[PDB]
Design a binder for this molecule. Structure first.
Ligand code: CU
Ligand code: CU
Ligand code: CU
Ligand code: CU1
Ligand code: CU1
Ligand code: CU1
Lengths: 336, 336, 337
């Protein structure tokens, strides 16, 4: 569009919500292209990531791991105000895999503590995409300290299957998956550090083994289980967006399926169907659409079951409604 | 269908055979929906997995690693009688990735030793699917002790390519790939245990490294070589089902291809074609269709070659027939 | 085709070029099927794989890691003269994933030092495909010693997207990604060896961890950076062929995309589109097509960022041209709150 045309576009401020929840949005675009405005403040803070009091100096967009899901439509502009308070100790920036140019925005958004920046980019490609911090010389460390999230760029006409039939979800959740690499002393106990930089050398040593100590959803072991399970009802259509900025994952809904799965996360690539377990390579986001058919507790996992059940990569859905004996029935219950 | 309608459907009792062979079945569905009945006894047994006499306490559906392939058609009912003998020591159950509800059947099939159960589920989705044991609190341990297999849910009109052209195999083989995590002593010799539970704590430590000590086909190094090499002839169309319940794999037929590969394992997702090496994520099954064109020895491997030739993920095919010099000829044999 | 019909086919002798460059070729086939002839000499040679001076005894097709990209069209015959000079100490062979029979040619190309062989195969399927050495009993050691490359079998009508539209690249690069497993001493410093065989047992131990010490493009940390950076211009269409003969990778162009990606490497399988990060399993090649829209530096990486930035799997593109503020603009440059 021409300079005047871009300047004339409506500007809309959106308030973000913490994962796994997603801010208000419409699936079908309302009106023509807009400049959708978001603000995130960066927080450096100690978080506890397991039941044994294990700490990480997190680097968190909007104070959360993962950072929040930002939702726009194709050919909207995403305009992010990014703030790095003077209480932080590191330079931070942002790389949007959805964006084109300047290392995804990373080269234009390098902000020291006490600085802010505003980046605008045109969301030319429909899909879910990773975003992450990427300070030159320390890229992986920032990313595995939790400084990553995702955005969704919806097609202007909403989602469709491979045959052009509309796929309209009733709810959407965003599951960000994080590999953490926590140093341990020679006794096997996880170390703690006073300042974020103090952990740098010990952490990189663990990173180089390529073996995470923890693999978690929403920033901690059990963050999406128990009373923090995600919810649905029988007949409800659910979109599950899943990201991993650094390492491969293989999501699986135990008791369910991915009816339609954009495994690559890109909406112009037709979705796979009837999936048992899908695969999202490190550095990407994917999305799965499922209509729930049975009530009960489901587990949603990375189906390397060691990562799921030993390292933390397991969430739950609690689903209300009536049981379908046609789909499944216990013909003879466990008996002597 | 109503319970009454289901009750009135034909029953067919199937007799299972040990992998890599697959029980007698039709590719095209013979008549309307049936209730297909299978029975499996759970055998906790010691298996030797390598030529060094390394032992695993296996947890084995039908006495094998992997468990046998069950074949039904879409919208059939799979009715499994699962038996846990008094000669066992652990609670076992079954999760069918093909099933909808109750953790794939796992919540409804928990049998203590001396108990049995009968689960029925509607096979609504066509494809190959993993099944595995999943006892709450010990899911990865059960799975990496060999308690997994796969089923095939065929389309009622049999297999087709991406454009609806029919694909009929002459032979079918089921390769179950297994990652084992065997503890070692301080000299690097593998440990032996006199009861399954004795290995638990040691085994969990190895599992947490995410690095298998062995990666094997059909339960042991060299299992599908020599007396167990798969066979075919030039001109023959072969389907190779491959599962991995816990860890990624990348099958490759050395000297051949995957002419058609349902890499995600799901038949409503069009297959990839002309594949050199395909990818199956942990927690999934896939299938490749190939027409042999050359005689001789072929190796079928996980194409991480360290996994194939150091850790044990290699099978052979012995193929009879006439050499084709158009496809390949030695113009000058190795010479000075 | 009969031996007589194949004898009647034209011959074309191709001079190979070193990666990441690709020898002259035509996207759309010129004429009917031909016998396309290549020669490679295998070199066992010491190579340096990082800025610290870490050495590997490499086993190298045409003297480079990766070996060079051979380009033919579907239904051409690729005829390779492979030479194992007497200065080498191991038997070598070649397995073409593109080929059908005799373990991809491995069974028919086993040459001791001082020997040569000529193999011909019909390139029946279009795509990019790995080739690698595979001597029985030492297969992964040969491969992770650098003895692998790729070929491209173009469709006779060139590349097209999943819907019949012609895709014509302006330039092509071949990025071979290599996992190395280098033994360390008790200091944690990389060990050097007098002869290739001296390193075997220590190397196999590292290999068994399934954890490479180095993951590199074009044979070394930073090999495709500085004056060796790949180049493009705004508006230019680039095909990037990427191979990994042993271990998975997840390519990503930082600041760009894969507009069309044959993630499986096979051209009869329709490409994925608008990709951020694609996935190529160990034992395969893939190809990505992109039209550059913005000038400046880009990094092309394996998006396990530890692999990219700690272990060496990062290359650079330098792109010339005019910046597009519609696509991206700094509304407010970094400035005090
Ligand atoms: Cu990135
Ligand atoms: Cu499962
Ligand atoms: Cu190979
Ligand atoms: Cu940061
Ligand atoms: Cu079990
Ligand atoms: Cu070799």
């Amino acid at each position: 569009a021409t300079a005047a045309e871009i300047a004339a576009l409506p500007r809309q401020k959106v308030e973000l919500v913490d994962p796994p929840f997603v801010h208000a949005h419409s699936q079908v675009a309302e009106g023509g292209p807009k400049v959708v405005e978001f603000t995130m403040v960066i927080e450096e803070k100690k978080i506890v990531i397991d039941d044994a009091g294990t700490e990480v100096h997190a680097m968190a967009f909007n104070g959360t791991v993962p950072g929040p899901l930002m939702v726009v439509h194709q050919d909207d502009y995403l305009e992010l105000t990014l703030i790095n308070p003077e209480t932080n100790t590191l330079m931070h920036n942002i790389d949007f895999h959805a964006a084109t140019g300047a290392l995804g925005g990373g080269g234009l958004t390098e902000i020291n503590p006490g600085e802010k920046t505003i980046l605008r980019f045109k969301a030319t490609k429909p899909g879910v995409f990773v975003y992450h911090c990427a300070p030159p010389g320390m890229v992986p460390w920032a990313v595995v300290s939790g400084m990553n999230g995702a955005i969704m760029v919806l097609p202007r006409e909403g989602l469709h299957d491979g045959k052009g039939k509309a796929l309209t979800y009733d709810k959407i959740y965003y599951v960000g998956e994080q590999d953490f690499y926590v140093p341990r002393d020679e006794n096997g106990k996880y170390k703690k550090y006073e300042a974020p930089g103090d952990a740098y050398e010990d952490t990189v040593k663990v990173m180089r083994t390529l073996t995470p100590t923890h693999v978690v959803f929403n920033g901690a072991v059990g963050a999406l289980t128990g009373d923090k399970a995600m919810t649905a009802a029988v007949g409800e259509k659910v979109l599950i967006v899943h990201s991993q900025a650094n390492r491969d994952t293989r999501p699986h809904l135990i008791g369910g399926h991915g009816d339609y799965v954009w495994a690559t996360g890109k909406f112009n690539t037709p979705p796979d169907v009837d999936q048992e377990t899908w695969f999202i390579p490190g550095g990407a986001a994917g999305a799965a659409f499922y209509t729930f058919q049975q009530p009960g507790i489901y587990a949603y996992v990375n189906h390397n079951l060691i990562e799921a059940f030993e390292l933390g990569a397991a969430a739950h859905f609690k689903v209300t409604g009536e049981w379908n004996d046609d789909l499944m029935t216990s013909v003879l219950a466990p008996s002597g």
